Amino acid sequence: ESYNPEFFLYDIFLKFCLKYIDGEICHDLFLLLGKYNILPYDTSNDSIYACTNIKHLDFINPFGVAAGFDKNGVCIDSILKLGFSFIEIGTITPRGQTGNAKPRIFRDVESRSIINSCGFNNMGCDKVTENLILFRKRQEEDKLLSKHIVGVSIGKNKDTVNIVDDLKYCINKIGRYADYIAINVSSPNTPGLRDNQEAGKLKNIILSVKEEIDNLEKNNLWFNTTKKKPLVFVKLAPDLNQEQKKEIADVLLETNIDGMIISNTTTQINDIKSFENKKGGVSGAKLKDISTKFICEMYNYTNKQIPIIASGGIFSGLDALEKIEAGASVCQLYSCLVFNGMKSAVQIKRELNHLLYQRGYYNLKEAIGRKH
Ligand SMILES: Cc1cc2nc3c(=O)[nH]c(=O)nc-3n(C[C@H](O)[C@H](O)[C@H](O)COP(=O)(O)O)c2cc1C
Numbered sequence: 001e002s003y004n005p006e007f008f009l010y011d012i013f014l015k016f017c018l019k020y021i022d023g024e025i026c027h028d029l030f031l032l033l034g035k036y037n038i039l040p041y042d043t044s045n046d047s048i049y050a051c052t053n054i055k056h057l058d059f060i061n062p063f064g065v066a067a068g069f070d071k072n073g074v075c076i077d078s079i080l081k082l083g084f085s086f087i088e089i090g091t092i093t094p095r096g097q098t099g100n101a102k103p104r105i106f107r108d109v110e111s112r113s114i115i116n117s118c119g120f121n122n123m124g125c126d127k128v129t130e131n132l133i134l135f136r137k138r139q140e141e142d143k144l145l146s147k148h149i150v151g152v153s154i155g156k157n158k159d160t161v162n163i164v165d166d167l168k169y170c171i172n173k174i175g176r177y178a179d180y181i182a183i184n185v186s187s188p189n190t191p192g193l194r195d196n197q198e199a200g201k202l203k204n205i206i207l208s209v210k211e212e213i214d215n216l217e218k219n220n221l222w223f224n225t226t227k228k229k230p231l232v233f234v235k236l237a238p239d240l241n242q243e244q245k246k247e248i249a250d251v252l253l254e255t256n257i258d259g260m261i262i263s264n265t266t267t268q269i270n271d272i273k274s275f276e277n278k279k280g281g282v283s284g285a286k287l288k289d290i291s292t293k294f295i296c297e298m299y300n301y302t303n304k305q306i307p308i309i310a311s312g313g314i315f316s317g318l319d320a321l322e323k324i325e326a327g328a329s330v331c332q333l334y335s336c337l338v339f340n341g342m343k344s345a346v347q348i349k350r351e352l353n354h355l356l357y358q359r360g361y362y363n364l365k366e367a368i369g370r371k372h
Pocket residue numbers: 066067068069071090091105114115116118120153184235263264265283284285287311312313314332333334335336
């Protein structure tokens with residue numbers, strides 16, 4: 001009963017943390033609990049009707065943890081054992097960074113919103129690779145983790161001129177241990193990063209990343225879950241106009257990107273009194289509708305040819321079903337872990353299974369894109 005993530009004390013501690021403790025400190029405490037493997041766990045098998053896939057990536061269930069939660073890969077086992085099918089570590093950069101000055105994370109509990117200006121704080125590609133190699137060694141000896149997927153989000157150091165150099169550096173160090181690589185061109189907290197979403201720049205970035213991944217073999221294998229070379233995803237920002245979204249879509253089709261993560265934080269949420277005039281991008285429930293509309297738009301601009309990982313405002317099974325019906329094959333959570341806590345995975349999985357049964361869906365795959 002105690003290791004059950006729905007134990008009552010966890011909600012007691014969650015409420016106390018959300019009322020009296022700084023956001024980053026709460027996060028650091030969660031990571032500390034996982035580092036010592038004293039977090040609750042849920043090793044129950046998941047419904048075979050709720051599993052999903054992106055190409056050859058077979059997700060035991062449709063819920064993972066978004067990037068920026070385990071930036072340095074120091075907590076992969078514990079987070080996954082909460083009930084998640086995958087996690088995206090990072091975003092990492094070649095050299096470590098401490099990020100912007102603190103406090104840089106703020107919460108609004110009433111609206112279930114977060115705002116952050118972290119600035120790609122992380123231990124750097126080389127250290128984080130060592131943490132991921134340790135996990136992959138543990139995974140090779142634990143059967144309960146053999147189907148779990150780990151992706152790596154890569155970006156650039158603040159002072160780097162040509163992003164492709166930094167992306168290549170990361171791919172050549174951590175790529176062989178990744179099940180997929182997420183190209184982060186959508187953080188609002190690294191000056192000029194979002195400009196790389198322009199079509200011509202993005203195209204060259206994607207081809208450069210894919211060419212570097214395809215060269216890992218020759219340069220001398222796959223110490224990951226798929227035992228295959230990592231897929232390539234792009235994470236997009238929701239603060240784009242329609243012509244930019246159409247131009248990106250055309251590039252994603254030409255370059256054969258394996259999927260698109262929709263979406264990162266936004267600067268369009270400005271009705272939160274306590275966040276006014278603050279730096280950073282907003283996450284949480286207020287982002288849900290904005291990011292779901294973005295899924296529908298890109299699902300149609302890419303003619304349904306590009307799989308979608310949903311990110312933004314997902315708290316309930318209904319929220320997740322809305323993303324799936326809009327076009328998503330899998331969902332990523334972040335703010336749900338902040339405001340619901342340890343029970344996030346267990347609870348949302350049960351809710352979705354109930355909804356699939358209620359709505360007359362045979363399985364989750366049948367629901368993908370049904371809104372359209
Ligand atoms: C504190 C914090 C740090 C984040 N860091 C990253 C990051 O490093 N890379 C990334 O791609 N997204 C990052 N994100 C964005 C989340 O991955 C996610 O896309 C966003 O929070 C929307 O999901 P949500 O509304 O369910 O929280 C971060 C978000 C927060 C709140």
